[PDB]
Amino acid sequence: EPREEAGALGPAWDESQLRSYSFPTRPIPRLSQSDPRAEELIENEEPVVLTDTNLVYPALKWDLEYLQENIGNGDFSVYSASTHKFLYYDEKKMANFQNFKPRSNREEMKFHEFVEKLQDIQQRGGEERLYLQQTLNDTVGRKIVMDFLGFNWNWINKQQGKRGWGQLTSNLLLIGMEGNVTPAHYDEQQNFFAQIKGYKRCILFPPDQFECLYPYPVHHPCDRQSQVDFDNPDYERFPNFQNVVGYETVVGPGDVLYIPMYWWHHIESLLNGGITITVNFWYKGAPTPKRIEYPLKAHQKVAIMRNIEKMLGEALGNPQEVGPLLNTMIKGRYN
Amino acid sequence: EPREEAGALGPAWDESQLRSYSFPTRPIPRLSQSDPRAEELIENEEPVVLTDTNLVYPALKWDLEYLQENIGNGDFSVYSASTHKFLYYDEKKMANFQNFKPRSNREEMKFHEFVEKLQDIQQRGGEERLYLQQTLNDTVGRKIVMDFLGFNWNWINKQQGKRGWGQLTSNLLLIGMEGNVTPAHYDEQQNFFAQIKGYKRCILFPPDQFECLYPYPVHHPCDRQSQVDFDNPDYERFPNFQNVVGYETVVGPGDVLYIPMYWWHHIESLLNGGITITVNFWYKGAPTPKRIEYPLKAHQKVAIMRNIEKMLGEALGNPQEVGPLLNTMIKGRYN
Ligand SMILES: O=C(O)C(=O)C[C@H](CCCc1ccccc1)C(=O)O
Ligand SMILES: O=C(O)C(=O)C[C@H](CCCc1ccccc1)C(=O)O
Ligand SMILES: [Zn+2]
Ligand SMILES: [Zn+2]
């Protein structure tokens, strides 16, 4: 249920701002950084919302005005779409599927250009949607550097150390419009997802729900994203989506959501909730141990399947032949 | 059609001695060793019957009396079954499938014991069937050594050399009763199949008919054998068996059938044709070239599928989990 803002400022959000879906959910725990139960959830690669890390405390003051003045004059990737759904696609893989035409369009622009194009849309009451998704890098101005340096590296570096993770891979800055949706997908890195402005509903599914969520082929541009349209699920093609069960939370400013690697997550910016701002923190997972303990975890079986698809594509010389060979291998033999 | 024996001794066999099956066939070429077309078929890994190799010329005099006196006192593997079908099973794999109970029983016996047990059956008019299948080895007596040494090694060694094959792996001695059937299966080695006594109908299918012939799982004891019962094909489980097309021949004494590696073959001893005797010659195939030429041959795709099954069984720690993972990989994704 919705949390209540300090100073009797009312519920920060209400249930009318959440989209409606076909499956049930149960809440992700919201705990203090100091709560041993939080450390045990992270250790066991289960999601948890930490309410008091201060991980991005200097960025809580961020808004569009502030960022435009200080984020510098680098290029920012901005996606545009006529739908609320911003399905990720990997442009390096579009050669394998020359029949895939994305629904989002990516435009590289300056931050002020992003603010203006967003202003124009608001002014003319258009229905075009934008989502800025850009890795933070050296081109940011001095006050963003100062803010970045003031993140709680003491806390997150200890996490990284305790869990045996690899190095921080990148931080993604995410600025979306109310109602934007990033469809369900899993990532191969560990993620601390730090909410800065506005509210995002996060729906996670464990790796053992692979069978219910139907990822695209590995060589397709939408590798790791679900094929299922959550707004109109096709149960004839995706029957096990009728068994899917999620873990849900709404993060607001100050919250940090641990999204364990291989966990599926669907992310939406709350309807009529204004713009959202988030920064994520991606780490490579801990190395695979030399001695493999059986039984294997769910995410290890996902990794085996990915590797089988990649090797078959290499061996056959063409990723389009992956599906026919696999069918030939199973029909009348393993089904 | 049936060939005619020299000296106006009539057709050696007639069509009434062949079992009846559901698919069509066309003949395998019968050619002279000296015929360039024969060399081109072998070079292109296509079956051919060579009528004049003299490969096992000293063994053409072999019968049960002769062999019993001279084959020595080693152990011979003899299979018994209540059916005409002698489905091969690999005893080293029976641990993976503790629910598989063979229909053939293997008994290790002396050759005279084989002749006697065969006599008893004939005497009492029983319907029990035997099939002796034994690798030739050092225990054979001097006259079999002399016979073996007189095979046409000049011709077969040149074949082995020309084709880049590996070393002769083994020679299998095969002594079966009229009507015995070895069900359809493929082998991973190259085979020169030398007929000595009686007549065997050989039905081959190219490796690109994998999809029509439904081999057992790699880790099952009947790895490489078809699951399809040729006498009662289940078209609901094995629908593509309705598209299978074979290449057929009847080999008699003096004939040598080249069975290329990965080619499926079904072998039957002709009804009411007496005992049959055969010796095969298995060679490892030529090494896989360093530079892989695309497109891949059918047998190369079979080998990829085999390797995928073997690695998945190793990675998962249990061959029983191979089928569920493969289904999970394909359902709603590649089918
Ligand atoms: O931080 C995460 O991991 C998220 O999923 C946040 C998500 C945007 C992700 C865009 C994307 C999708 C697939 C691959 C790489 C990038 C959002 O907040 O809308
Ligand atoms: O020479 C061949 O290759 C044959 O198929 C001949 C065949 C008996 C083969 C028995 C067997 C089946 C599977 C694996 C190893 C051995 C016959 O003539 O009845
Ligand atoms: Zn993600
Ligand atoms: Zn064989």
XYZ file of C-alpha atoms and ligand atoms in Angstrom:
710
model
C 0.000 0.000 0.000
C 1.095 3.638 -0.464
C 3.513 5.245 1.967
C 2.723 8.615 3.555
C 4.941 11.639 2.989
C 6.481 13.387 6.001
C 4.796 16.571 7.208
C 1.253 15.172 6.626
C 1.686 15.935 2.924
C -0.593 13.025 2.028
C 0.044 9.753 0.242
C 2.806 10.291 -2.268
C 0.881 8.189 -4.806
C -2.343 6.217 -4.974
C -3.395 2.959 -6.589
C -5.154 4.740 -9.462
C -1.691 5.636 -10.852
C -0.744 1.959 -11.458
C -1.488 0.168 -14.718
C -3.629 -2.971 -14.517
C -2.217 -6.388 -15.384
C -3.328 -10.037 -15.466
C -1.090 -11.578 -12.821
C -0.849 -11.375 -9.006
C 2.020 -9.871 -7.033
C 3.268 -9.698 -3.466
C 5.382 -6.851 -2.082
C 9.180 -6.557 -2.144
C 10.448 -5.921 1.438
C 11.307 -2.260 2.233
C 14.033 -2.247 4.875
C 16.812 -0.161 6.444
C 20.376 -0.528 5.171
C 21.217 -1.525 8.752
C 18.629 -4.310 8.898
C 20.388 -7.740 8.901
C 17.450 -9.100 6.904
C 18.357 -6.695 4.112
C 21.951 -7.985 4.012
C 20.677 -11.586 3.921
C 18.347 -10.826 0.982
C 21.158 -9.278 -1.032
C 23.467 -12.169 -0.105
C 20.858 -14.610 -1.358
C 20.259 -12.604 -4.586
C 16.681 -11.627 -3.710
C 15.328 -8.108 -4.287
C 14.962 -5.645 -1.457
C 14.188 -1.911 -1.341
C 16.626 -0.006 0.973
C 15.049 3.184 2.229
C 18.002 4.959 3.881
C 21.248 4.286 2.007
C 21.854 7.951 1.035
C 23.349 6.428 -2.057
C 22.425 9.358 -4.316
C 21.671 11.913 -1.654
C 23.327 14.870 -3.528
C 21.200 14.087 -6.626
C 17.881 14.388 -4.774
C 17.971 18.125 -5.589
C 18.119 17.342 -9.317
C 15.445 18.616 -11.684
C 15.450 19.598 -15.353
C 16.436 23.219 -14.668
C 19.416 22.143 -12.540
C 20.592 19.439 -14.918
C 20.390 21.629 -18.016
C 22.621 24.234 -16.391
C 25.195 21.739 -15.108
C 25.177 18.414 -16.995
C 27.348 19.900 -19.696
C 27.084 19.859 -23.475
C 27.502 16.193 -24.330
C 25.183 14.074 -26.424
C 22.252 12.317 -24.740
C 20.359 9.362 -26.187
C 16.642 10.211 -26.225
C 14.025 7.673 -27.341
C 10.688 8.697 -28.834
C 7.617 6.467 -29.244
C 3.919 6.772 -30.003
C 3.178 4.155 -27.293
C 3.862 4.153 -23.581
C 6.069 1.058 -24.059
C 9.810 1.620 -24.633
C 10.932 -1.879 -25.584
C 14.729 -2.066 -25.527
C 16.449 -3.205 -28.747
C 20.163 -3.866 -29.302
C 21.140 -2.084 -32.507
C 24.196 -4.300 -32.986
C 21.852 -7.278 -33.545
C 19.487 -5.669 -36.075
C 21.591 -7.107 -38.908
C 20.554 -10.651 -37.911
C 16.851 -9.671 -38.145
C 16.459 -7.228 -41.049
C 12.670 -7.624 -40.632
C 12.637 -6.019 -37.154
C 11.556 -2.363 -37.240
C 11.733 -0.729 -33.782
C 8.769 1.162 -32.409
C 11.055 3.553 -30.488
C 13.224 6.011 -32.397
C 16.556 7.072 -30.901
C 17.717 10.653 -31.409
C 21.053 11.907 -30.109
C 20.589 15.448 -28.791
C 21.850 18.077 -26.346
C 20.204 18.234 -22.946
C 18.615 21.635 -23.575
C 17.217 20.190 -26.810
C 15.695 17.386 -24.724
C 14.142 19.917 -22.330
C 12.770 21.998 -25.214
C 11.313 19.100 -27.193
C 9.665 18.039 -23.965
C 8.369 21.585 -23.479
C 6.941 21.703 -27.015
C 5.078 18.427 -26.470
C 3.663 19.727 -23.185
C 2.734 23.050 -24.807
C 0.879 21.589 -27.814
C -0.691 18.832 -25.688
C 0.770 16.148 -27.951
C 0.855 12.463 -27.111
C 4.413 11.760 -28.272
C 6.519 10.291 -25.474
C 10.221 10.638 -24.675
C 12.650 8.673 -22.520
C 16.197 9.901 -21.996
C 18.534 6.981 -21.234
C 22.221 7.993 -21.145
C 25.343 6.649 -19.466
C 27.001 9.248 -17.282
C 30.498 10.036 -18.532
C 33.337 12.626 -18.445
C 31.433 15.328 -20.317
C 29.280 16.329 -17.315
C 29.861 19.745 -15.785
C 31.616 20.454 -12.514
C 28.532 20.549 -10.254
C 27.389 17.143 -11.543
C 30.884 15.834 -10.934
C 30.650 17.238 -7.350
C 27.235 15.588 -6.919
C 28.446 12.263 -8.362
C 31.476 12.338 -6.058
C 29.142 12.798 -3.121
C 27.225 9.558 -3.726
C 27.587 7.030 -0.874
C 30.533 5.098 -2.359
C 31.486 3.926 1.118
C 28.247 1.879 1.316
C 28.065 0.608 -2.236
C 31.784 -0.259 -2.430
C 31.338 -2.393 0.705
C 28.383 -4.123 -0.961
C 30.489 -4.779 -4.036
C 33.289 -6.118 -1.788
C 31.078 -8.279 0.428
C 29.278 -9.877 -2.544
C 32.412 -10.519 -4.579
C 31.067 -8.562 -7.512
C 33.202 -7.192 -10.316
C 33.764 -3.533 -11.016
C 31.120 -0.865 -11.462
C 30.253 -1.128 -15.166
C 28.335 2.081 -15.715
C 25.701 4.406 -14.266
C 22.671 4.975 -16.475
C 20.751 8.259 -16.108
C 17.040 7.748 -16.808
C 14.599 10.619 -17.298
C 11.111 9.556 -18.373
C 7.626 11.015 -18.705
C 4.710 9.981 -16.521
C 3.256 6.705 -17.822
C 6.429 5.512 -19.579
C 6.962 1.742 -19.305
C 10.109 -0.269 -19.838
C 8.739 -3.766 -20.676
C 9.824 -6.870 -18.765
C 13.427 -7.929 -19.336
C 16.415 -9.235 -17.423
C 19.984 -7.966 -17.392
C 23.126 -9.957 -16.873
C 24.640 -7.510 -14.294
C 23.776 -6.795 -10.676
C 21.839 -3.548 -10.263
C 21.367 -1.015 -7.529
C 18.526 1.143 -8.897
C 18.523 4.553 -7.220
C 15.354 6.646 -7.461
C 15.812 10.436 -7.500
C 12.576 12.096 -8.648
C 9.038 10.905 -8.951
C 7.836 7.328 -8.456
C 8.344 4.103 -10.426
C 6.461 0.855 -9.975
C 8.902 -2.071 -10.272
C 7.588 -5.574 -10.894
C 10.210 -8.323 -10.642
C 10.024 -12.011 -11.505
C 12.629 -14.564 -10.386
C 14.823 -16.303 -12.928
C 12.875 -19.550 -12.427
C 9.934 -17.842 -14.264
C 11.876 -18.045 -17.550
C 9.212 -20.481 -18.813
C 6.373 -18.027 -18.193
C 8.021 -14.959 -19.796
C 9.235 -16.093 -23.226
C 12.408 -14.028 -24.002
C 13.187 -13.371 -27.621
C 15.961 -15.472 -29.272
C 19.446 -14.552 -28.100
C 20.410 -13.253 -31.536
C 17.250 -11.106 -31.889
C 17.647 -7.362 -31.084
C 15.201 -7.852 -28.161
C 17.364 -10.525 -26.559
C 16.507 -10.686 -22.804
C 13.179 -8.921 -23.200
C 9.857 -10.812 -22.871
C 7.890 -11.398 -25.987
C 4.644 -11.156 -24.024
C 2.589 -7.965 -24.439
C 1.635 -7.339 -20.806
C -1.299 -5.158 -21.934
C -2.743 -7.909 -24.210
C -1.128 -11.269 -23.415
C -1.494 -13.887 -26.126
C -2.170 -16.994 -24.061
C -2.233 -19.254 -27.107
C 1.402 -18.497 -27.918
C 2.454 -17.867 -24.291
C 0.336 -20.199 -22.197
C 2.613 -20.221 -19.130
C 2.260 -16.495 -18.771
C -0.957 -17.512 -16.988
C 1.216 -18.822 -14.123
C 3.465 -15.775 -13.751
C 3.703 -14.211 -10.269
C 5.557 -10.939 -9.578
C 7.223 -9.128 -6.698
C 6.205 -5.466 -6.668
C 7.156 -2.162 -5.144
C 6.939 1.568 -5.807
C 10.251 3.371 -5.257
C 10.348 7.087 -4.671
C 13.123 9.650 -4.062
C 15.758 8.247 -1.733
C 14.873 4.567 -2.284
C 17.311 2.080 -3.747
C 16.000 -1.168 -5.251
C 18.369 -4.138 -5.511
C 17.587 -5.890 -8.771
C 19.614 -9.139 -8.736
C 21.174 -10.285 -11.969
C 18.897 -12.445 -14.217
C 15.818 -11.195 -12.386
C 13.142 -10.021 -14.782
C 11.845 -6.540 -14.111
C 9.128 -4.368 -15.576
C 9.441 -0.676 -14.691
C 6.762 1.993 -15.041
C 6.705 5.715 -14.215
C 3.478 6.347 -12.323
C 0.506 7.651 -14.318
C 0.078 11.419 -13.812
C 3.087 11.431 -11.509
C 5.269 13.856 -13.431
C 8.698 13.218 -14.798
C 10.856 10.534 -13.174
C 14.569 10.496 -12.639
C 16.641 7.456 -11.751
C 20.299 6.488 -11.708
C 21.283 2.821 -11.820
C 24.552 1.201 -10.754
C 25.507 -1.949 -12.743
C 28.156 -4.376 -11.467
C 29.449 -7.554 -13.047
C 28.430 -10.572 -11.042
C 30.822 -12.579 -8.918
C 32.903 -15.073 -10.908
C 31.534 -18.558 -11.414
C 33.100 -20.829 -8.760
C 35.644 -23.419 -9.853
C 33.713 -26.277 -8.204
C 30.093 -26.283 -9.424
C 27.655 -27.160 -6.647
C 24.610 -29.026 -7.704
C 21.729 -28.492 -7.892
C 22.227 -25.530 -10.215
C 20.457 -22.255 -9.548
C 17.801 -21.030 -11.975
C 20.056 -18.290 -13.350
C 22.753 -20.827 -14.089
C 20.301 -22.741 -16.276
C 19.363 -19.505 -18.077
C 23.089 -19.001 -18.733
C 23.429 -22.489 -20.107
C 20.534 -21.896 -22.497
C 22.021 -18.583 -23.634
C 25.351 -20.281 -24.262
C 23.741 -23.111 -26.256
C 21.979 -20.540 -28.505
C 25.207 -18.557 -29.028
C 27.316 -21.610 -29.913
C 24.701 -23.002 -32.267
C 24.527 -19.680 -34.067
C 28.300 -19.700 -34.447
C 28.538 -23.337 -35.484
C 25.692 -23.156 -38.024
C 27.104 -19.921 -39.459
C 23.702 -18.224 -39.347
C 21.484 -17.368 -36.356
C 18.369 -17.917 -38.466
C 19.139 -21.645 -38.526
C 19.127 -21.918 -34.701
C 15.424 -22.459 -34.346
C 15.043 -25.179 -37.051
C 17.938 -27.216 -35.667
C 16.625 -27.030 -32.108
C 13.174 -28.146 -33.294
C 14.769 -30.980 -35.247
C 16.637 -32.004 -32.072
C 13.545 -32.151 -29.881
C 10.540 -33.154 -31.991
C 9.555 -36.744 -31.253
C 12.734 -37.184 -29.191
C 12.497 -34.990 -26.093
C 8.851 -33.859 -26.262
C 15.023 -57.005 -58.998
C 16.685 -60.340 -58.123
C 19.983 -61.320 -59.705
C 20.416 -64.729 -61.346
C 22.968 -67.229 -60.072
C 25.643 -68.515 -62.458
C 25.092 -71.944 -63.997
C 21.318 -71.348 -64.503
C 20.820 -72.118 -60.810
C 17.817 -69.788 -60.698
C 17.204 -66.514 -58.909
C 19.177 -66.532 -55.695
C 16.203 -64.968 -53.885
C 12.725 -63.731 -54.713
C 10.587 -60.823 -53.572
C 8.497 -63.027 -51.271
C 11.521 -63.211 -48.917
C 11.451 -59.438 -48.181
C 9.439 -57.949 -45.330
C 6.831 -55.332 -46.237
C 7.175 -51.721 -45.109
C 5.340 -48.396 -45.465
C 7.863 -46.332 -47.403
C 9.228 -46.359 -50.978
C 12.793 -47.157 -51.995
C 15.020 -46.948 -55.046
C 17.997 -49.237 -55.675
C 21.589 -48.719 -54.514
C 23.938 -48.959 -57.559
C 25.745 -52.327 -57.958
C 29.054 -51.678 -59.702
C 32.543 -53.076 -60.340
C 35.428 -52.000 -58.109
C 37.031 -50.736 -61.328
C 34.065 -48.560 -62.298
C 34.981 -44.837 -61.904
C 31.374 -44.195 -60.880
C 31.929 -46.439 -57.870
C 34.983 -44.419 -56.783
C 33.003 -41.176 -57.175
C 30.144 -42.506 -55.007
C 32.518 -43.484 -52.222
C 34.328 -40.141 -52.537
C 31.013 -38.351 -52.164
C 29.951 -40.539 -49.184
C 27.069 -42.225 -51.019
C 26.386 -45.967 -50.745
C 27.381 -48.361 -53.481
C 27.484 -52.169 -53.697
C 30.831 -53.439 -55.151
C 30.395 -56.850 -56.707
C 34.005 -57.905 -57.383
C 36.355 -56.617 -54.678
C 37.420 -60.099 -53.458
C 37.605 -58.392 -50.116
C 36.714 -61.521 -48.126
C 37.317 -64.092 -50.811
C 38.953 -66.688 -48.447
C 35.910 -66.472 -46.118
C 33.406 -67.412 -48.835
C 34.050 -71.069 -47.912
C 32.950 -70.390 -44.325
C 30.043 -72.277 -42.787
C 29.202 -73.351 -39.243
C 31.088 -76.657 -39.500
C 34.254 -74.906 -40.715
C 34.096 -72.091 -38.185
C 33.481 -74.370 -35.209
C 36.585 -76.390 -36.041
C 38.829 -73.366 -36.609
C 37.563 -70.182 -34.912
C 39.130 -71.257 -31.656
C 37.789 -71.392 -28.116
C 37.156 -67.750 -27.293
C 33.939 -66.239 -26.021
C 31.312 -65.092 -28.531
C 28.501 -62.653 -27.783
C 25.198 -64.273 -28.788
C 21.894 -62.385 -28.552
C 18.566 -64.140 -28.049
C 15.106 -62.627 -28.609
C 11.500 -63.733 -28.936
C 11.030 -61.250 -31.825
C 12.735 -60.985 -35.182
C 14.002 -57.509 -34.188
C 17.451 -57.282 -32.546
C 17.483 -53.656 -31.424
C 21.006 -52.665 -30.394
C 21.445 -51.290 -26.852
C 24.614 -49.873 -25.274
C 24.985 -51.508 -21.870
C 27.231 -48.710 -20.602
C 24.248 -46.316 -20.835
C 21.654 -48.469 -19.042
C 22.499 -46.708 -15.771
C 21.065 -43.435 -17.134
C 17.748 -45.185 -17.944
C 17.065 -47.746 -15.200
C 13.563 -48.151 -16.700
C 14.872 -49.616 -19.988
C 14.614 -53.419 -20.102
C 16.119 -54.868 -23.309
C 14.147 -57.301 -25.415
C 17.341 -59.090 -26.522
C 19.341 -61.091 -23.994
C 23.108 -61.373 -24.435
C 24.807 -64.640 -23.502
C 28.562 -65.115 -23.748
C 29.259 -68.630 -25.032
C 31.698 -70.853 -26.928
C 31.170 -71.249 -30.651
C 30.227 -74.928 -30.397
C 27.685 -73.916 -27.748
C 26.267 -71.434 -30.270
C 26.042 -74.161 -32.929
C 24.374 -76.575 -30.497
C 21.829 -74.116 -29.112
C 20.993 -73.328 -32.709
C 20.674 -77.051 -33.436
C 18.350 -77.581 -30.456
C 16.071 -74.759 -31.618
C 15.969 -76.226 -35.128
C 15.341 -79.720 -33.737
C 12.434 -78.781 -31.437
C 10.994 -76.355 -34.011
C 11.138 -73.495 -31.509
C 10.677 -69.851 -32.405
C 13.516 -68.446 -30.293
C 15.976 -66.476 -32.413
C 19.737 -66.004 -32.104
C 22.208 -63.501 -33.530
C 25.932 -63.931 -32.974
C 27.714 -60.559 -33.124
C 31.398 -60.762 -32.117
C 34.511 -58.734 -32.870
C 37.239 -60.851 -34.403
C 40.313 -60.918 -32.176
C 43.539 -62.842 -31.362
C 41.797 -65.944 -30.032
C 40.861 -67.285 -33.493
C 42.568 -70.449 -34.683
C 45.298 -70.666 -37.288
C 43.088 -71.342 -40.334
C 40.926 -68.298 -39.536
C 44.088 -66.259 -39.156
C 45.197 -67.566 -42.610
C 41.782 -66.666 -44.056
C 41.792 -63.207 -42.432
C 45.300 -62.565 -43.764
C 44.061 -63.417 -47.232
C 41.409 -60.678 -47.306
C 42.030 -58.043 -50.012
C 43.945 -55.577 -47.805
C 45.585 -54.120 -50.896
C 42.182 -52.803 -52.081
C 40.722 -51.712 -48.773
C 43.956 -50.082 -47.546
C 43.987 -47.993 -50.742
C 40.382 -46.984 -50.051
C 41.325 -45.992 -46.523
C 44.302 -44.019 -47.913
C 42.415 -42.308 -50.737
C 39.541 -41.223 -48.461
C 41.747 -39.995 -45.632
C 40.063 -42.284 -43.149
C 41.543 -43.258 -39.807
C 42.643 -46.734 -38.861
C 40.612 -49.915 -39.110
C 38.682 -49.960 -35.822
C 37.413 -53.519 -35.746
C 35.864 -56.303 -37.816
C 32.519 -57.571 -36.555
C 31.529 -61.174 -37.354
C 27.753 -61.486 -37.766
C 25.942 -64.823 -37.908
C 22.149 -64.559 -37.914
C 19.109 -66.734 -38.553
C 16.794 -66.275 -41.513
C 14.366 -63.425 -40.789
C 16.571 -61.641 -38.233
C 16.347 -57.838 -38.461
C 18.707 -55.222 -37.110
C 16.445 -52.124 -36.812
C 17.348 -48.801 -38.428
C 20.324 -47.021 -36.879
C 23.388 -45.050 -37.893
C 26.999 -45.531 -36.857
C 29.660 -42.903 -36.514
C 32.335 -44.891 -38.470
C 32.719 -45.658 -42.159
C 31.718 -49.227 -43.009
C 32.601 -51.716 -45.682
C 30.012 -54.469 -45.121
C 31.215 -57.747 -46.619
C 28.630 -60.473 -47.234
C 29.852 -64.078 -46.945
C 26.852 -66.422 -46.724
C 23.207 -66.020 -47.487
C 21.467 -62.766 -48.420
C 20.691 -59.570 -46.490
C 18.373 -56.783 -47.565
C 19.946 -53.416 -46.672
C 17.797 -50.294 -46.564
C 19.734 -47.044 -46.139
C 18.530 -43.509 -45.482
C 20.742 -40.427 -45.885
C 21.692 -38.343 -42.876
C 19.327 -35.569 -44.018
C 16.415 -37.920 -43.051
C 17.242 -37.413 -39.353
C 13.873 -35.639 -38.986
C 11.921 -38.619 -40.318
C 13.651 -41.316 -38.213
C 13.558 -40.059 -34.617
C 16.737 -41.427 -32.897
C 16.564 -42.017 -29.188
C 18.234 -39.429 -26.877
C 22.022 -39.550 -26.968
C 22.210 -40.723 -23.361
C 19.613 -43.501 -23.863
C 21.011 -47.049 -24.402
C 19.462 -46.998 -27.918
C 21.374 -43.877 -28.915
C 21.619 -43.784 -32.761
C 18.772 -46.226 -33.282
C 15.362 -45.074 -34.611
C 12.505 -45.017 -32.212
C 10.089 -45.881 -35.017
C 8.727 -49.447 -35.110
C 9.013 -50.146 -38.842
C 6.412 -52.934 -38.535
C 3.825 -50.626 -36.859
C 4.849 -46.977 -37.261
C 3.172 -44.583 -34.854
C 2.475 -41.627 -37.123
C 1.061 -39.529 -34.297
C 4.383 -39.522 -32.452
C 6.542 -39.800 -35.602
C 4.671 -37.906 -38.288
C 7.674 -37.304 -40.571
C 8.238 -41.006 -40.898
C 5.530 -40.640 -43.562
C 8.105 -38.808 -45.722
C 10.959 -41.296 -45.335
C 12.515 -42.663 -48.551
C 15.139 -45.443 -48.576
C 17.907 -46.768 -50.798
C 17.742 -50.560 -51.003
C 19.769 -53.537 -52.085
C 20.169 -57.247 -51.395
C 23.802 -58.288 -50.913
C 24.850 -61.877 -51.329
C 28.161 -63.773 -51.033
C 30.993 -61.769 -52.550
C 29.228 -58.380 -52.393
C 30.556 -55.480 -50.370
C 28.210 -52.633 -49.410
C 29.718 -49.238 -48.574
C 27.679 -47.796 -45.733
C 28.892 -44.191 -45.286
C 29.177 -42.843 -41.780
C 25.945 -41.287 -40.350
C 23.861 -43.104 -42.948
C 20.923 -44.894 -41.386
C 20.643 -48.548 -42.291
C 18.146 -51.292 -41.601
C 19.476 -54.804 -42.242
C 17.439 -57.990 -42.593
C 18.414 -61.612 -43.283
C 16.078 -62.854 -46.001
C 13.005 -64.822 -44.905
C 13.551 -68.577 -45.392
C 17.025 -67.877 -46.732
C 19.026 -69.844 -44.189
C 21.700 -68.535 -41.915
C 23.613 -65.405 -42.934
C 27.226 -64.563 -42.381
C 28.771 -61.125 -42.731
C 31.995 -59.402 -41.752
C 32.103 -55.615 -41.477
C 35.120 -53.305 -41.609
C 34.771 -50.089 -39.530
C 37.096 -47.115 -40.067
C 37.176 -43.787 -38.283
C 36.159 -40.993 -40.591
C 38.578 -38.458 -42.000
C 39.421 -35.643 -39.575
C 37.256 -32.546 -39.595
C 39.000 -29.911 -41.757
C 40.512 -26.876 -40.061
C 38.575 -24.442 -42.285
C 34.842 -25.244 -42.157
C 33.177 -24.817 -45.544
C 29.633 -23.674 -45.466
C 27.002 -24.813 -46.097
C 27.428 -27.673 -43.637
C 26.661 -31.227 -44.680
C 23.744 -33.064 -43.082
C 26.036 -35.305 -41.031
C 27.805 -32.278 -39.629
C 24.479 -30.998 -38.300
C 23.773 -34.414 -36.743
C 27.171 -34.136 -35.028
C 26.354 -30.701 -33.726
C 23.089 -31.970 -32.251
C 24.854 -34.925 -30.631
C 27.424 -32.580 -29.126
C 24.746 -30.221 -27.769
C 23.000 -33.177 -26.042
C 26.285 -34.446 -24.551
C 27.353 -31.043 -23.194
C 23.939 -30.313 -21.736
C 23.964 -33.652 -19.957
C 27.374 -32.843 -18.511
C 26.527 -29.273 -17.564
C 23.177 -30.134 -15.945
C 24.770 -33.039 -14.063
C 21.985 -35.415 -15.094
C 20.955 -36.627 -18.568
C 17.322 -36.819 -17.460
C 17.233 -33.017 -17.300
C 18.263 -32.632 -20.973
C 14.791 -32.878 -22.394
C 13.081 -30.388 -20.000
C 15.751 -27.740 -20.557
C 15.586 -28.088 -24.336
C 11.785 -27.769 -24.227
C 12.112 -24.723 -21.989
C 14.552 -23.226 -24.524
C 12.262 -23.670 -27.515
C 8.637 -23.395 -26.389
C 7.166 -20.075 -27.492
C 10.635 -18.905 -28.567
C 11.770 -21.000 -31.531
C 8.556 -22.885 -32.381
O 18.102 0.017 -14.445
C 17.465 -0.922 -15.223
O 18.135 -1.911 -15.222
C 16.257 -0.763 -15.825
O 15.591 -1.661 -16.380
C 15.593 0.619 -15.811
C 14.678 0.866 -16.950
C 15.322 1.304 -18.258
C 16.207 0.207 -18.853
C 16.480 0.429 -20.347
C 17.244 -0.781 -20.791
C 16.533 -1.969 -21.117
C 17.238 -3.143 -21.495
C 18.644 -3.112 -21.549
C 19.351 -1.933 -21.254
C 18.638 -0.754 -20.871
C 13.696 1.973 -16.527
O 13.829 2.500 -15.302
O 12.800 2.370 -17.256
O 27.783 -53.635 -39.967
C 26.765 -52.878 -39.435
O 27.182 -51.769 -39.274
C 25.497 -53.308 -39.201
O 24.526 -52.590 -38.889
C 25.175 -54.798 -39.361
C 24.046 -55.270 -38.526
C 24.364 -55.602 -37.075
C 24.787 -54.361 -36.286
C 24.659 -54.567 -34.770
C 24.988 -53.238 -34.163
C 23.978 -52.238 -34.094
C 24.279 -50.954 -33.566
C 25.584 -50.687 -33.109
C 26.579 -51.679 -33.151
C 26.273 -52.970 -33.686
C 23.484 -56.546 -39.178
O 24.073 -56.994 -40.296
O 22.523 -57.147 -38.726
Zn 16.958 -3.525 -16.643
Zn 25.331 -50.488 -38.303
